[PDB]
Amino acid sequence: AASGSALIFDEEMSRYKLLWTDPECEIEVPERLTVSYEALRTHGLAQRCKAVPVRQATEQEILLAHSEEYLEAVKQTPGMNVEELMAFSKKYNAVYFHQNIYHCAKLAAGATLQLVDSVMKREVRNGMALVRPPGHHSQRSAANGFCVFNNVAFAALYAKKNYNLNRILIVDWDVHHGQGIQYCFEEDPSVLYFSWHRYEHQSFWPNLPESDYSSVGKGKGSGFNINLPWNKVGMTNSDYLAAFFHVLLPVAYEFDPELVIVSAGFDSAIGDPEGEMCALPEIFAHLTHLLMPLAAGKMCVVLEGGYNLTSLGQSVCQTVHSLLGDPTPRISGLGTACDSALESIQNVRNVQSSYWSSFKHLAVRTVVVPPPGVELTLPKNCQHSGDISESTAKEVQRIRDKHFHDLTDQNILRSLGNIISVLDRMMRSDEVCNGCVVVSDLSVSVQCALQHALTEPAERVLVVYVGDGELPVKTNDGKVFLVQICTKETEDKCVNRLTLCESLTAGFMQALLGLILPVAYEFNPALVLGIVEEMRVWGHMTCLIQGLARGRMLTLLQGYDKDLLELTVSALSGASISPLGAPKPEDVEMMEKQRQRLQERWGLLRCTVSESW
Ligand SMILES: NCCc1cccc(C(=O)CS)c1
Ligand SMILES: [K+]
Ligand SMILES: [K+]
Ligand SMILES: [Zn+2]
């Protein structure tokens, strides 16, 4: 099992700049790298990473994605003067050269490959490469968009050649379109490329019609190229999370990539002079967190864009915070995506529906309280309950004598006291983050847990229950939401409940991505409460649900199943999730009925533009 995050940086890639007047390239400055690294130092993040040294990518490694003619042309640049460098740069669009830029491009490519080697050799779980020059615009025989060599396409081809990978996901969240990556893998079904980008109906750089949603890939790669064009500026956290939930994440979890590579361009963040979007840097934690269960956590975040030198640091720090397993911040104010985003999402979903069927339409952080008298090997970052306290027992006696009463079983009372202690240590302290408890009586345990959490205080509580029957929880007031996954059809009354009733694994994952997570993110709970009465998708569920409530999740398990207990504990402690690798049409109809029944209240469910009266 691999552990730790790799940070790969070198001050040498900060030693090339623009040597002439050019308002188009004035933003791409060396200080970018500096601002990032110092930021990671200030919040104590770079020190928590394994620092892998950069290297030069070799000639043949460069020839994996570029031609001999272009490589020979660039290798001649370190011998040019400023007039010659400017004349050479004039031969391409939106790029400038320097005497050190060939050296630094070899270093950026080599750092990318070092990250790939470190992640695939299980030396580290994931990693980030702070490189310069960027790469996602460069092409086989041309430099483009501040890019010399395509670092991420290098990484994909390198992984394929040196580890025999069959499926590699590339996620490009730069506001610009990785034309070079697309070009490189357009007819390659091995490498699934997703990109969102500011397009403005083709009036924005690079002004390519193939940057539209119509480009789904050519030949054998048709369906493995996904372009989401924003045609209006000012896209927010809601637009980004809707794009993730209703386009990328379902396709990615069905693709089941053996390796995730991210083009980390942070010009999609608020404040950037180039992107002009309104997405907070915190969103890049969740963008990262939602991608974690893929490829068993093997993620290679590579730097691309980002030119606001007073917010690049915040975005990079959020990405690294998420990569190290730190709790993601609570995203508030979420709602429906804007009409332009909904149009882009529905258009890409429609065009892609012939390749991904889910798009068709009808015309110490963890605390463990195991059964009294058991003993298990808790992960290095898990401990047991520290017995109880005098105040805990007094509150237990009060709750007993005042409410249920007629209860003398010391086991159920001890379970309730442990639940109270875990809540007090999760919410009213910066120590434990999440926790799991095995209980006996479902009614008493659930009532105690919920009612005590509400007075922690907890502004709101998400309640994910797996089982049948009615549990004692009120969905009338606006303080508790319930997601129940049962077997009986029940009904779809109220609007603060999501009831869901073998290919059940694909159906459950689709329901989690398209229904559960959007409503949960818009709800913004202060605590997630898991209940399971007496399956094999619970790991991804528990991992992805920790994006809510700043990670605070209390799980109650009715049944001493060591498998499920170990799975829950490892999911809470932050361990890697083994991937899964065709849902029933009745379940699809039920999911769409739930969507049509809830989306007027929970706008994150919407993946089509609403029609007025
Ligand atoms: N205003 C300049 C427009 C431009 C041109 C080429 C690349 C970029 C990038 O941000 C690289 S990701 C921006
Ligand atoms: K992009
Ligand atoms: K492709
Ligand atoms: Zn960019």
Swiss-Prot record:
| Catalytic activity from the UniProt record | N(8)-acetylspermidine + H2O = spermidine + acetate; N-acetylputrescine + H2O = putrescine + acetate; N-acetylcadaverine + H2O = cadaverine + acetate
Q: Which residues participate directly in catalysis?
A: H137
Q: Does the keyword Secreted apply?
A: no
* Record GO biological process: epigenetic regulation of gene expression; homologous recombination; macroautophagy; polyamine deacetylation; spermidine deacetylation; swimming behavior
Q: Where in the cell is it found?
A: Cytoplasm; Nucleus
| A GO cellular component annotation in the UniProt record | cytoplasm
Main EC class the enzyme belongs to: hydrolase
Q: Listed GO molecular functions?
A: acetylputrescine deacetylase activity; acetylspermidine deacetylase activity; deacetylase activity; zinc ion binding
Pfam families linked:
Hist_deacetyl
Establish whether keyword Protein biosynthesis is in the entry.
no
What the entry lists under Gene3D superfamilies is as follows:
Histone deacetylase domain (3.40.800.20)
Family stated for the protein in its record? Belongs to the histone deacetylase family. HD type 2 subfamily.
Question: What job does this protein perform?
Answer: Polyamine deacetylase (PDAC), which acts preferentially on N(8)-acetylspermidine, and also on acetylcadaverine and acetylputrescine. Exhibits attenuated catalytic activity toward N(1),N(8)-diacetylspermidine and very low activity, if any, toward N(1)-acetylspermidine. Has a very weak lysine deacetylase, if any.
Record's protein name: Polyamine deacetylase HDAC10
Q: Which organism is it from?
A: Danio rerio
Q: Gene encoding this polypeptide?
A: hdac10
